[PDB]
Amino acid sequence: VNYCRLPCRGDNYHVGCGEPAYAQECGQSPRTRELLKEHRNEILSKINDVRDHVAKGSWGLPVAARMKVVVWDAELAGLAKRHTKGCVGETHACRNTERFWLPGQLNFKYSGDKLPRIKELIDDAVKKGHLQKHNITREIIENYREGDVKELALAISDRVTAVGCGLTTWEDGAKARALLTCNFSSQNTRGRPVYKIGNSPGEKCIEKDETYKNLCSATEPIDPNKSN
Numbered sequence: 001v002n003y004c005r006l007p008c009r010g011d012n013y014h015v016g017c018g019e020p021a022y023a024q025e026c027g028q029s030p031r032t033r034e035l036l037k038e039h040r041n042e043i044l045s046k047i048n049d050v051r052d053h054v055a056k057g058s059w060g061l062p063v064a065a066r067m068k069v070v071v072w073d074a075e076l077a078g079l080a081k082r083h084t085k086g087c088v089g090e091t092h093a094c095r096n097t098e099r100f101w102l103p104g105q106l107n108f109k110y111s112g113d114k115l116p117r118i119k120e121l122i123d124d125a126v127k128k129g130h131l132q133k134h135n136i137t138r139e140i141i142e143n144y145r146e147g148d149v150k151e152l153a154l155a156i157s158d159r160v161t162a163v164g165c166g167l168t169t170w171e172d173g174a175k176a177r178a179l180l181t182c183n184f185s186s187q188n189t190r191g192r193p194v195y196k197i198g199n200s201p202g203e204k205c206i207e208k209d210e211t212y213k214n215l216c217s218a219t220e221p222i223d224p225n226k227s228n
């Protein structure tokens, strides 16, 4: 679609509208970084690993009734990439698409003396999410409220069906910096369950996956535009 002609409630500009440019806030040495097949696979791998693990009723969290295996979405990734060119985590841009009406978004920031390889930037984001296992609770799962839990909680939403990420790195303030942004097909909704509870893992899947045995397969007809 032409994002300039896809409106959104609130009437904010769409992140995809117009020609790409680096924000002045990126300083004068920004570079958008291509996430290659190996990177995309790793992101998916870790997201699906944690979903499968939580789905079994791990970490004291409830068993998940219908948690689907997540796929990579090129459109979401393209919008995430465009977002990173602003070098700012939170903005008020719209980022809706025709298939995904209210995409979720995570932003991972890095600042350090040296710039890590792309794989280390991804590992750092994963670690951050993983460490949130000490913050998330059965209560949060039953009734979403946003230490931090946003990143891990979005990864295990059973409304989420797809993810796509992008990355820009730059130099400012005597530091190497990065912004890794991941857009998801859905968002958690304040006051609603992160995922639906089951007595057994995938007890409500039309079909369970053979690889991530506690999740629904990739063809599970989950509507990402509905909440719990």
Ligand SMILES: CCCCCCCCCCCCCCCC(=O)O
Pocket: 043, 046, 047, 049, 050, 051, 053, 106, 122, 125, 126, 129, 130, 151, 152, 155, 182
């Ligand atoms: C690029 C980051 C994607 C979004 C955040 C990722 C969510 C955390 C992933 C953690 C993976 C670890 C899951 C395995 C659970 C276990 O074996 O204990």
Ligand SMILES: [Pr+3]
Pocket: none
């Ligand atoms: Pr390519």
